[PDB]
């Protein structure tokens, strides 16, 4: 099961030499054809100014990934991985690996870096490769950029500027990064905006619907768990409404078209988060090369 990927453009032999150093690494392709133009290879078809990172993660979640195998005079022999079989992947990711790590694939954050992908580009095409990051770093950096997205609205004060200055600097075993802020020109990108607004509104509809629904199920057979659920929500109400005006008058009667819309809206707004909630693992390593330049990893997925 091999793929051929040709280039329409003139390539030098020095371009092959700067290409062949990426000998066994992951590329994304949108769908599997037997012969594919190189304009679909890499994330260059998706990356632009006004989409953002979460679009790249969402379209990377279903983009089929393919290891590179061989370079020829004009075409590239790609090899699609299979489940459970070992392969050799080079660590082009910015974080070193150790034996027994669980690897996920996330889009890169240094778009247009000082390296410029070690100057592998073309006329109106720069070949961009996704980062292969260990799973705990992947999930925490997702959480870090999301809470960067929450504070991106209230950037008036200076202690929030110091907090997000802490947020840019990441820490890891011999690894430190300045994470780029998703807010640019005093506005958020649209994907982070809809992700964070949907998350906050899921929290809101949960906090204002859980009482009536735990009552609706607690008219049935009861247990200790729903009792402590109601007590927890009483703790939230007794720490929440200490300054709000008394008699808010929440009714036990409410028309059905309200709450079915509320439930379906809550479910679709949480449903659009599971690209960033679940971190679908793709690799684990059985042996690491010295100087961590490559690793024999077993494919998951």
């Amino acid at each position: 099961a091999n793929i051929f990927c040709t280039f329409d453009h003139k390539l030098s032999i020095a371009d092959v030499g700067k290409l062949t150093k990426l000998v066994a690494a992951v590329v994304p392709i949108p769908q599997r054809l037997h012969l594919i133009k190189h304009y679909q290879l890499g994330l260059h078809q998706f990356v632009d100014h006004t989409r953002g990172y979460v679009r790249l993660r969402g379209l990377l979640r279903n983009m089929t990934l393919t290891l590179m195998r061989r370079v020829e005079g004009n075409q590239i022999l790609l090899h699609v991985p299979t489940h459970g079989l070992l392969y050799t992947v080079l660590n082009t990711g910015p974080v070193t690996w150790e034996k027994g790590d669980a690897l996920c694939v996330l889009p890169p954050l240094f778009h247009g870096p000082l390296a410029r992908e070690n100057l592998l580009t073309l006329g109106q095409w720069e070949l961009v490769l996704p980062w292969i990051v260990p799973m705990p770093l992947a999930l925490e950096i997702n959480q870090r950029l999301l809470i960067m997205g929450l504070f991106s609205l209230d950037r008036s004060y200076e202690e929030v500027k110091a907090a997000v200055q802490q947020l840019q600097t990441i820490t890891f075993r011999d690894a430190t990064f300045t994470i780029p802020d998703p807010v640019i020109d005093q506005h958020l990108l649209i994907d982070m905006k809809t992700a964070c607004l949907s998350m906050s509104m899921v929290a809101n509809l949960a906090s204002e619907l859980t009482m009536t629904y735990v009552r609706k199920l607690a008219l049935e057979d009861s247990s200790m768990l729903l009792v402590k659920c109601q007590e927890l929500l009483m703790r939230l109400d007794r720490e929440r409404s200490v300054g709000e005006p008394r008699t808010p008058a929440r009714p036990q009667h409410v028309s059905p078209d309200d709450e079915i819309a509320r439930l379906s809206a809550l479910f679709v707004m949480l449903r659009q988060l599971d690209d960033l909630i679940r971190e679908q693992v793709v690799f684990t390593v059985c042996d690491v090369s010295p100087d961590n330049k490559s690793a024999t990893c077993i494919f998951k997925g």
């Binding site: 679009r55 679709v268 449903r271």
Partner: peptide, 13 residues
């Protein structure tokens, strides 16, 4: 009328 994944996919993408 009602919000769906097609509504937000039309608005986003």
């Amino acid at each position: 009328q009602l919000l769906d994944t097609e509504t937000i996919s039309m608005l986003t993408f």
